[PDB]
Design a protein around this ligand. Structure first.
Ligand SMILES: Nc1ncnc2c1ncn2[C@@H]1O[C@H](COP(=O)(O)OP(=O)(O)OP(O)(O)=S)[C@@H](O)[C@H]1O
Ligand SMILES: Nc1ncnc2c1ncn2[C@@H]1O[C@H](COP(=O)(O)OP(=O)(O)OP(O)(O)=S)[C@@H](O)[C@H]1O
Ligand SMILES: [Mg+2]
Lengths: 191, 314, 216, 190
């Protein structure tokens, strides 16, 4: 059940849900596994807010355990194409795709909470198929893997070798460690 | 009480110079002046419609583009009464009884009709219906006979003559659609929705008996410079009554135009900056100070300060 | 049958002292008084609009913070009547007929109109349309011609021209957004949201006509 | 199904769910297995109520039975960041994350019921995989576990060594005993 909230205007008061009312203030809420339908909804909220006020800055709350890489590309491409500067704030944890979208945020506005968590792991490509099919499919993950490392490298600024060395296995980064590594610029300052 | 046939030489000069005079008062919007002046020429020439008005025009455009100024000045140039009927008041169907009068046996029957009486009193005049869109859709039906038959019957059965009346309706229906920002990666086309709105707002029959639908374009930066000059001239006339004189540097005019230039609000903001920047400082001096008598005001701007530098030497 | 102060242009002592007298009566609104006083001075200096009203002012700010005190005191200082209309009553679609008057053949035609009759009886007066935001959009449309043309045709056909009156409209649209802070973890800059909210509530045609939007 | 309560507004009465109507009264019902969606929902309610009144506190009735620490930690981070404190009224089962979240409440405003029970235990995750992967998971899980014990100990003020010893194995603390331990200020007056 989504809680209902009330707003006020000269004409009267309208009833809206918690997410919509908060979305009226340019605050998006990303939650749960990344699905194609989920990503379609997130990008839709960005395009709507872009027209409403381009000068203002969106706030994409990235609290998810990750998912399909393809879905995230739509969110990542949308986050850049729009004129506003998306601010990514982690709340509880950052997964592989969550981390990539976290670093993709506009430099100078990325923030994280003191007890936030982060994680980056190599994509999983375990499947059974024909010998010929396996080679074609396997070639694709290498390009995406290298592509993913290059994109985060540009935002993070670390050399490609640094990303390759760290991504060799699963790695977790705490909130203070995140700023040191360069995933985000600073911790969330008191309001 | 209508223009005589076989137009005289004096009247001829006015018709050829009408377009030039209107353009000087209202800069830009050349197409609007061309439609009004050409229609009047044909009527005087004897090629006008036998049973229709001189011209029925719908002026749809952004705010402050002079939709009503071109009509008010036209009456002044031709020295004909300006029958300005505000359509904001006629927002409901019941208001139709005010224009044509109440039917027999009901209150207000004696009062008559404003539109019928006004046209009867002034056969040759400019009928300006401002904010036509804001009126109830049913009110537009009354104009159908006027645009086609040229006559509107009153409660008493009197029929008005609209053959010499210039019907001009101003609306800002399409302004909202054009100004609204589209949503999507690729910017959507513009200027198409504005025409669609008029089609939705007005029935096909209404748009089928209209001489033309003139679209007023947004004022350009160059046009705004002329607008600032026009407002300064009005201030100079007011000051001349008191004997005061005002001189503004060309640089100051350009600076003031940029400060108040607004595409959405058109030319009206220019009056506001003129009032605050020029009228307010002079107001204190005019009442008590050097400007009480003599004037000889000189105004310029300082590049470093970027503020106006007023001078008062009575 | 008026105080005779307005007819005499040479009596400029009141205008120079208008700010001082108003400032002692109302505290904390010196900026509003200065804008109001300067506007009347230009109107009395011969720089007034030929057909528009003396001045259209939208009083936007918090409720009860010196908005109606300046209006009542101004009328006494200028020796003009005070026309106060409550817009809360005029919130329905058909309420507009009360002010302009009902058309011929309908009930209420005999009544000339609450607003039209008052301005005709008192051409020089202060029109206080409090709670303007509450007013129906139809009422806003009527005000457009008032600022642009200066005359409201009544049911009887009499032109209710009032170019000498000073129009003041009290609203609380801006105080709402500024008082309420943003939502979400990171704070947001809402300095300009008040003006944007006013832009949404009031149609551009209405806002463009206004001389200035006073702030309290 | 939920109730339909008719709140009183100037324009007209508006039906609302029991959660929404009580949300107007600064009540945020927390219940059920900790989930990212649930945690995200709870923080959204608190942020909306902060705008209504910064000075007034935001009530919080917690009946969570425990769950993923990361999902639950989201509320803890936002709670400290928000200006209005949260009255953590624990009226039911309080698991590790639930009790941990309950302890997060500002001093002088917390509450607990004597009938209820509050237990604190270390999180347990049976991760399986390669030896190298297990070592990585062991590092981060112990690190976050230490972080939970350090932040929890900070608010109560008790020595970190004492809290670590108690959390070494599963244990339950009676609600009245919790007052003496410092988990909560005191039980409800009446
Ligand atoms: N094209 C223009 N050229 C010169 N002055 C202009 C022009 N348009 C507007 N103005 C100035 O602005 C004043 C007011 O313009 P309006 O006649 O109110 O414009 P409008 O677009 O017809 O308004 P509506 O009908 O309210 S949308 C005129 O009297 C001029 O002083
Ligand atoms: N800022 C102020 N300065 C001086 N007197 C004030 C001020 N605000 C309120 N008052 C007094 O409030 C009294 C009661 O008048 P009210 O109409 O209730 O309030 P108001 O502020 O004049 O107007 P609104 O309509 O309430 S905003 C007036 O007679 C004033 O003396
Ligand atoms: Mg107009």
């Amino acid at each position: 059940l989504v809680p209902m909230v009330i707003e006020q205007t000269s004409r009267g008061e309208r009833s809206f849900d918690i997410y919509s009312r908060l979305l009226k203030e340019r605050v998006i809420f990303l939650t749960g596994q990344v699905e194609d339908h989920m990503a379609n909804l997130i990008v839709a909220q960005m395009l709507f807010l872009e027209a409403e006020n381009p000068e203002k800055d969106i706030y994409l709350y990235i609290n998810s355990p990750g998912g399909v890489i393809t879905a995230g590309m739509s969110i990542y491409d949308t986050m850049q194409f729009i004129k506003p500067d998306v601010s990514t704030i982690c709340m509880g944890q950052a997964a592989s795709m969550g981390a990539f979208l976290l670093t993709a945020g506009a430099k100078g506005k990325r923030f994280c909470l003191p007890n936030s968590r982060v994680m980056i792991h190599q994509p999983l490509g375990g499947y059974q198929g024909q010998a010929t099919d396996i080679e074609i499919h396997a070639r694709e993950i290498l390009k995406v893997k290298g592509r993913m490392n290059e994109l985060m490298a540009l935002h993070t600024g670390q050399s490609l070798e640094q990303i390759e060395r760290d991504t060799e296995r699963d790695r977790f980064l705490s909130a203070p460690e995140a700023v040191e590594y360069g995933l985000v610029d600073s911790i969330l300052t008191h309001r | 009480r209508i223009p005589e046939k076989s137009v005289s030489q004096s009247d001829r000069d006015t018709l050829k110079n009408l377009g030039d005079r209107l353009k000087m008062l209202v800069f830009g919007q050349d197409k609007a002046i061309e439609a009004l002046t050409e229609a009047i020429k044909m009527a005087r020439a004897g090629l006008g419609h036998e049973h229709k008005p001189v011209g029925s025009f719908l002026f749809a455009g952004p705010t402050g583009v002079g939709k009503t100024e071109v009509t008010v000045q036209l009456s002044k140039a031709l020295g004909i009464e300006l029958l300005r009927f505000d359509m904001s008041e006629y927002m409901e169907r019941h208001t139709v009884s005010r224009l044509i009068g109440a039917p027999p046996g009901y209150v207000g029957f004696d009062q008559g009709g404003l539109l019928t009486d006004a046209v009867i009193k002034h056969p040759h005049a400019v009928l300006l219906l401002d904010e036509i869109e804001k009126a109830h859709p049913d009110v537009f039906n009354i104009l159908l006979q006027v645009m086609d038959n040229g006559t509107l019957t009153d409660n008493n059965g009197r029929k008005a003559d609209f053959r010499n009346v210039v019907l001009v309706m101003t609306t800002n229906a399409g302004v909202r659609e054009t100004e609204r920002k589209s949503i999507g990666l690729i910017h959507q086309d513009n200027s198409t929705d504005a025409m669609e709105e008029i089609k939705k707002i007005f029935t096909p029959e209404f748009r089928n008996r209209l001489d033309n639908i003139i679209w007023f374009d947004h004022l350009s930066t160059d046009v705004i410079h002329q607008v600032v000059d026009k407002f300064i001239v009005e201030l100079q006339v007011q000051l001349d009554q008191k004997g005061v004189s005002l001189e503004v540097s060309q640089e100051a005019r350009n600076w003031l135009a940029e400060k108040g230039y607004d595409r959405a609000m058109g030319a009206r903001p220019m009056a506001r900056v003129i009032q605050d920047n020029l009228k307010k400082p002079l107001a204190n001096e005019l009442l008590f100070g050097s400007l009480v008598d003599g004037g000889q005001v000189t105004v310029a701007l300082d590049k470093e300060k970027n503020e106006l530098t007023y001078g008062f030497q009575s």
